[PDB]
Amino acid sequence: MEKEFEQIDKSGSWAAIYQDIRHEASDFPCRVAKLPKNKNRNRYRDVSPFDHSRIKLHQEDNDYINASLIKMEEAQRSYILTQGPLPNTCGHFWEMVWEQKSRGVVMLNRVMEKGSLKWAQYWPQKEEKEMIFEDTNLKLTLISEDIKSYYTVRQLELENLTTQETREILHFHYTTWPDFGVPESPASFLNFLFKVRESGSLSPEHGPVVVHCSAGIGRSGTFCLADTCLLLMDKRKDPSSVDIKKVLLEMRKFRMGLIQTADQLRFSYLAVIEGAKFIMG
Ligand SMILES: [Mg+2]
Structure with a gap:
């Protein structure tokens, strides 16, 4: 599958393959995301969850969050992909984490987007300054x-103030994805994936991992896509039969737009190829 990658490179046809994907990708209604009452719960007008796979919040008012369950039947892994929380949706974000029984959150964007403007900070910066979400x-x-060179892992305590029940959530923040373009080597991204796997956060004993970036479709899509293709290569008789384009189209049945550029698609192939070599040994 590495020679095919070499053939797409030699050919210069990453854009073509990427457009074949956008073209073939599923189209399902997002009627709930589009209701006038939820406008302010979407970060981006052009990224919405399908009605069929959206995560529903359990509490009373309005069950909408821009989040989708991606359920990979053959790999036996589920992910929830969601946009970076908005100042008004941080309460909803953690309510979803609670209700879906997730053990980990994986973040792949910067909170100080490029050098532009800090986004809503949805976890506490300081031990002594905990956050209380009044609405949820x-x-x-x-x-x-714990700040490492290429990622930061935090341990958070989430408490449901109704019951006083408490849970430890692990937050994995990959901090070195370049502000434009993609990493030239997938080694630190793969190491990050393997750290998240090692933590037990992706175990089917827990609720699905919550994955996000800016819109929850690009960098996020790379994490979910590389994880799943590596699982399948490890699970199939013939690891050879794993077709990353087919796996991505499968993922796109659950959330639109996964993998946002041809360069991200190529990086995803490259990460699965290097991952396989590493997990091969
Ligand atoms: Mg301090």
Whole structure:
């Protein structure tokens, strides 16, 4: 599958293959995302969850969050992909984490987008300054933080203030994806994926991992896509039969737009190729 990658490179046809994908991709209604009452719950007018796979919040008012369940039947793994929370949706974000019983959150964007403008900070920066989400009745505490060269892992305590029940959530933040373009080497992204796997966060004993970036479709899509293709290569008789384009189209049945550029598609192929070589040994 590496020689095919070499053939697409030699051919210069990454854009063509990427457009074949956008063309073939599923189209399902997003009627709930488009209701006038939810406008302010979407970060981007052109990225919405399909009605069929959207995550529903359990509380009473309005069950809408821009988040989709991606359920990969053959790999036996599920992910929830969601946009970076808005100042008004951080309460909803953690309510979803609570309700879906997720153990991990994986973030692939910057909160200070490029050098532009800091986005809503949805976890506490300081141990002594915990956050209380009044609308969803949740308290969130930073317990520890470990800053490595290419990612930061934080341990958070999430408490449901109704029941006083408490859960440890692991937050994995990949911090070195370049502000434009894609990493030239997938080695730190793969190491990050393997750290998240090692943590047990992706175990089917837990709710699905919550994955996000800016719109929850590009960098996020790369994480989910590389993870799933690597699972399938490890699970199939013939690891050889894994077709990344087919796996991505399958993912796109659950959330639109996964993998946002031809360069991200090529990077995803490259990460699966290098991952396989590493997991091959
Ligand atoms: Mg301090």
